[PDB]
Amino acid sequence: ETSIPEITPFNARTSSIKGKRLNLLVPSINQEHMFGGISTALKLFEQFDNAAFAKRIILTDATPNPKDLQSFKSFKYVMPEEDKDFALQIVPFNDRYNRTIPVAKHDIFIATAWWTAYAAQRIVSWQSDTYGIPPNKILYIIQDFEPGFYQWSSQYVLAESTYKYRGPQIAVFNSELLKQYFNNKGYNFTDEYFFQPKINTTLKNYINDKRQKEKIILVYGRPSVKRNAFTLIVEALKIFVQKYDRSNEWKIISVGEKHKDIALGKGIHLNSLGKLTLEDYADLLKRSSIGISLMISPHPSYPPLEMAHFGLRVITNKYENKDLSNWHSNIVSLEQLNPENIAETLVELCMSFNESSNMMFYINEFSFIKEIEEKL
Amino acid sequence: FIETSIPEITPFNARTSSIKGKRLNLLVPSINQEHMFGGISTALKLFEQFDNAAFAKRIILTDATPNPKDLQSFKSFKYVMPEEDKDFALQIVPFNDRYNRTIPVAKHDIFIATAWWTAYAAQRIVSWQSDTYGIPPNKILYIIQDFEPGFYQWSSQYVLAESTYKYRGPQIAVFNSELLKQYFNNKGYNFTDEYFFQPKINTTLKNYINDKRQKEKIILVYGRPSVKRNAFTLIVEALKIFVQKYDRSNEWKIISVGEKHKDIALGKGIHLNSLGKLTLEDYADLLKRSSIGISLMISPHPSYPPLEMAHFGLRVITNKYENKDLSNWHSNIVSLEQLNPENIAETLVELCMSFNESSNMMFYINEFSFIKEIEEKL
Numbered sequence: 001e002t003s004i005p006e007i008t009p010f011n012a013r014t015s016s017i018k019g020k021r022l023n024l025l026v027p028s029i030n031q032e033h034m035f036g037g038i039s040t041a042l043k044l045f046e047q048f049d050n051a052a053f054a055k056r057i058i059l060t061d062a063t064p065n066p067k068d069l070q071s072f073k074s075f076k077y078v079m080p081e082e083d084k085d086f087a088l089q090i091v092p093f094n095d096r097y098n099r100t101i102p103v104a105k106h107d108i109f110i111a112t113a114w115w116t117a118y119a120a121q122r123i124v125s126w127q128s129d130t131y132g133i134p135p136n137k138i139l140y141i142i143q144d145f146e147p148g149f150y151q152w153s154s155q156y157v158l159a160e161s162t163y164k165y166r167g168p169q170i171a172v173f174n175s176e177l178l179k180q181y182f183n184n185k186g187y188n189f190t191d192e193y194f195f196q197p198k199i200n201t202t203l204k205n206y207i208n209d210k211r212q213k214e215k216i217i218l219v220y221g222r223p224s225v226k227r228n229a230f231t232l233i234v235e236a237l238k239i240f241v242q243k244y245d246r247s248n249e250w251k252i253i254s255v256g257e258k259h260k261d262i263a264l265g266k267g268i269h270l271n272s273l274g275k276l277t278l279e280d281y282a283d284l285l286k287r288s289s290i291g292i293s294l295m296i297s298p299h300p301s302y303p304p305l306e307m308a309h310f311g312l313r314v315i316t317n318k319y320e321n322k323d324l325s326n327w328h329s330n331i332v333s334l335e336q337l338n339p340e341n342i343a344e345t346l347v348e349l350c351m352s353f354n355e356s357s358n359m360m361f362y363i364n365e366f367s368f369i370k371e372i373e374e375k376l
Numbered sequence: 377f378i379e380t381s382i383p384e385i386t387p388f389n390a391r392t393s394s395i396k397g398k399r400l401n402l403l404v405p406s407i408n409q410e411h412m413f414g415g416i417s418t419a420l421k422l423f424e425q426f427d428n429a430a431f432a433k434r435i436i437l438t439d440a441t442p443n444p445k446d447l448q449s450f451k452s453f454k455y456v457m458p459e460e461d462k463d464f465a466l467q468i469v470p471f472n473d474r475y476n477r478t479i480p481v482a483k484h485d486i487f488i489a490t491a492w493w494t495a496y497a498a499q500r501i502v503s504w505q506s507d508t509y510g511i512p513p514n515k516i517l518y519i520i521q522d523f524e525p526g527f528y529q530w531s532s533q534y535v536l537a538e539s540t541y542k543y544r545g546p547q548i549a550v551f552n553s554e555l556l557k558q559y560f561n562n563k564g565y566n567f568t569d570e571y572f573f574q575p576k577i578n579t580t581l582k583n584y585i586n587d588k589r590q591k592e593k594i595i596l597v598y599g600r601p602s603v604k605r606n607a608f609t610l611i612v613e614a615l616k617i618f619v620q621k622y623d624r625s626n627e628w629k630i631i632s633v634g635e636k637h638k639d640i641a642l643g644k645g646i647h648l649n650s651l652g653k654l655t656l657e658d659y660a661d662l663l664k665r666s667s668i669g670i671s672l673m674i675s676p677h678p679s680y681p682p683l684e685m686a687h688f689g690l691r692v693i694t695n696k697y698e699n700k701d702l703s704n705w706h707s708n709i710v711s712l713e714q715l716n717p718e719n720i721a722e723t724l725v726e727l728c729m730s731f732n733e734s735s736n737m738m739f740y741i742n743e744f745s746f747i748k749e750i751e752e753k754l
C-alpha cells in the first residue's frame with residue numbers, strides 16, 4: 001500500500017450558485033451500507049429548514065443502487081459534471097479521480113466519517129482562496145472517536161487530525177458522553193453540540209407490554225464490528241457453560257448480525273437470529289432476562305439501553321468516562337474486562353434470576369439545529 | 377469461516393514441579409533471529425542482568441519454536457521439552473504448540489512477561505500457582521515495551537491487552553522509557569511497583585558520533601511499511617506533496633532505511649530508494665552524510681531513530697504523541713502537533729531552505745541499575 005485511499009483528493013471547481021447550500025458528505029446511502037451513523041446523520045440533516053438552505057448530499061465512497069435512491073425521491077440525482085441549482089440533489093463522488101465537484105461561494109459542508117471531514121477541511125481552504133473569503137464554518141457530526149477504528153497508524157493520526165483542525169468548526173457529538181471524552185482529550189472546536197440517545201419509536205410501543213421472562217441470555221453479537229467484541233463474548237460464554245452446572249437450563253441467543261451457530265460445549269450453542277425486525281426484537285426482549293452487549297468506545301450504544309429498559313440484567317463494558325451502571329439499575333459495568341469476569345458475572349446473574357433510571361431522557365431531540373442554522 | 381476464539385489467549389496449562397529453589401521465567405513470543413526485534417532483545421538484555429547464581433533461569437517461548445541457528449545465541453541454555461522436568465540452571469522450553477500439553481511450574485517459579493498476552497498468561501498462572509501450592513500470589517515482573525492495546529483497533533484484543541494493566545494482583549512494571557511510565561500514570565494504571573529504563577545510544581553508533589561529517593542534501597526516511605506505528609504511507613504521501621510543491625526538490629536525494637521495500641515514485645522522476653536495514657556501520661555512515669530526517673512513532677514511547685538522527689546532526693521531523701514531545705529532548709528535533717501530509721511536506725520545505733546544538737537528554741549518551749533492587753523483592 002503506497003497511498004492512503006481515505007484521503008484521495010477531493011477536487012472542487014467554481015459554481016455560479018449565489019445562495020447558501022448545505023452539503024452532507026456521507027460515504028454511502030445504500031440500504032446495504034445503511035448503518036446507524038449515516039442514518040442518524042440523514043435524520044439530523046433533514047432537520048435543516050429546507051426553505052432557508054439548498055441541500056446536496058455528496059456520496060464519497062459508494063454509488064447508489066436505483067432501489068436505494070427510492071428513499072430519496074424528492075432529490076435529483078445529478079452527476080458531478082453538471083452544475084444545476086436544484087433545491088435538493090445527490091451527487092455520486094466516489095469515482096473521483098480527475099473529476100471535480102462544483103463548490104459555491106456559500107457552500108457549507110457537513111462531515112460525518114473522519115475522512116469526509118478531512119476532505120471538507122481541505123475544500124474550505126480552496127473555497128477561501130478561490131473566492132477570497134474568510135473560511136466557512138464546517139459542521140462536523142462526530143459519531144465516535146473514529147481514530148479508535150484503527151490501530152496506531154497513518155489512518156489513526158489522519159482521522160484524529162480532523163479534530164485538530166484549527167479552522168472554524170462546529171462539533172455535533174453523538175451523546176454527551178462522547179462530547180466529554182473529546183473535552184478530556186483536550187480537543188477544541190468553535191462550537192460544541194450533542195444529541196442524546198433516544199429510544200427507537202417502534203420499541204417504545206412495546207415497553208409497556210406484560211413480559212413473561214424466560215431463561216434466555218441475549219447476546220448482541222456482531223463478528224464484523226470489532227467494537228462489539230464478539231470473540232471476547234464467545235470466550236466468556238464457553239467458560240460460563242463449563243463453570244456453571246445450571247448452564248443447561250439457559251438458552252443463549254445472538255441477535256444483531258447473522259452468523260454461523262457457535263458451539264460453546266456440552267452440546268449448547270449460541271444461536272444466531274441475525275437482525276430481527278423491530279417487532280420480533282421487541283418480543284424477544286420481553287421474554288429475555290439476561291443481556292450481554294459490549295461497545296469498546298466512550299460513546300453509548302443502543303442495545304444495552306434497550307435491554308435494560310425491557311427488564312433485562314445487562315452485562316456491559318465500562319470505557320473511560322462511559323459507565324452505564326449509573327444510567328440504569330439493570331446495567332452492570334465490568335471494570336476488568338476478560339472472559340473470566342464476564343462468565344462470573346453471568347453466573348451471578350443467572351443465580352439472581354431465582355427499577356431505577358437516571359437516564360429519563362432516553363424515553364422522551366435536535367433542538368439545537370435551529371440555533372446552529374443561525375451561525376451559517 | 378468466522379474467528380471464534382482469541383489465539384493470543386490460548387490456555388497456558390501448568391503442572392506441579394519438584395523444584396524447591398527460586399526460578400525466573402522469561403515469557404517471550406520468540407527468540408528467532410527473524411523475529412528478533414527490539415522488544416524481545418531488550419527483554420533478553422534485561423533478563424541477562426539477574427544474578428544467575430541467585431536464580432535459575434528459564435526462557436519460555438510462547439509463539440515460535442527456534443531454528444537450530446537461533447539457539448546458537450543461547451549456547452549456555454539447555455533446550456528442554458515441556459514434558460520434561462529438569463532442574464537445570466539455564467533452560468529454554470518451546471511452548472507455542474501448547475494444546476493438551478503442560479509446562480512445569482514450581483512453587484517459587486516467578487514470571488517475567490513481555491507481550492501483553494504473555495502477561496495475560498502469567499497472571500492466570502499465578503492464580504493456579506497460588507491455589508495449587510496454597511501460597512500468597514507471587515509478584516509478576518511485567519516488562520512494558522509500549523501501550524500494546526494501541527497495536528489493535530478497538531476490539532477484543534484491545535481490552536484483553538489492556539486488562540493485563542488492570543490486574544489487581546502483585547505486579548512490578550518495568551517501562552521502556554520514563555515517557556511511557558508517565559503515559560500509564562496519566563491513564564490511571566496501578567502497579568505494586570514501577571520501574572523504567574531510559575533509551576541509551578547503541579554502543580556501535582556512539583563510536584562514530586565524533587567523526588567529521590560532510591553533510592550532503594539527503595532526506596533520510598525511517599520507512600517500515602510493516603510497522604503501522606511508523607506511518608510509512610503517511611510519510612510517502614507527504615513526500616509526494618513535497619516533490620510537487622518544492623521547486624528545489626530535484627536537488628535532494630530521498631532515502632529510506634529500516635526495512636527493505638520496493639522503490640517508490642514520488643513524481644518528477646524522483647524516487648524514495650530503500651536501503652533496507654543497513655549494518656550499524658553503514659547506517660552510521662549514512663547518518664553522517666544525511667542532513668534531514670523523517671521518523672514517526674505513533675505511540676507515547678520514544679523510538680531510537682529520531683534520537684540517533686538528531687545526535688548525528690540531522691534536522692529530524694517527528695510526531696508528537698500526548699506527553700511525548702521530542703522537540704524538548706534535542707534542538708535538532710521538530711515535533712509536529714498537526715500530523716498530516718501537508719504539514720510534513722511544509723516542514724520539509726522549511727528545513728531544506730534552512731540547509732542553505734542543544735540537548736536535554738544527556739542520559740542518552742551515558743543502565744539497568746534497578747535490577748538489583750528488584751531482585752530483593754522476589
Ligand SMILES: Cc1cn([C@H]2C[C@H](O)[C@@H](COP(=O)(O)OP(=O)(O)O)O2)c(=O)[nH]c1=O
Binds near residue numbers: 035200302306
Ligand atoms: C439487535 C437489533 C437491533 N435493532 C435496531 C435497534 C437498535 O437500536 C439498532 C442497533 O443496531 P444498528 O443501529 O444497526 O447498529 P449500528 O448503527 O452500529 O449499525 O437497530 C433491530 O432492529 N433489530 C435487532 O435485532
Ligand SMILES: Cc1cn([C@H]2C[C@H](O)[C@@H](COP(=O)(O)OP(=O)(O)O)O2)c(=O)[nH]c1=O
Binds near residue numbers: 415652653655656681
Ligand atoms: C535504520 C536502521 C536502524 N538500525 C538500528 C538503530 C536503532 O537503535 C534500531 C531501531 O530499529 P529496529 O530495532 O528495527 O526497530 P524496533 O526496535 O522497533 O524493531 O535499529 C540499524 O542497525 N540499521 C539500520 O539500517
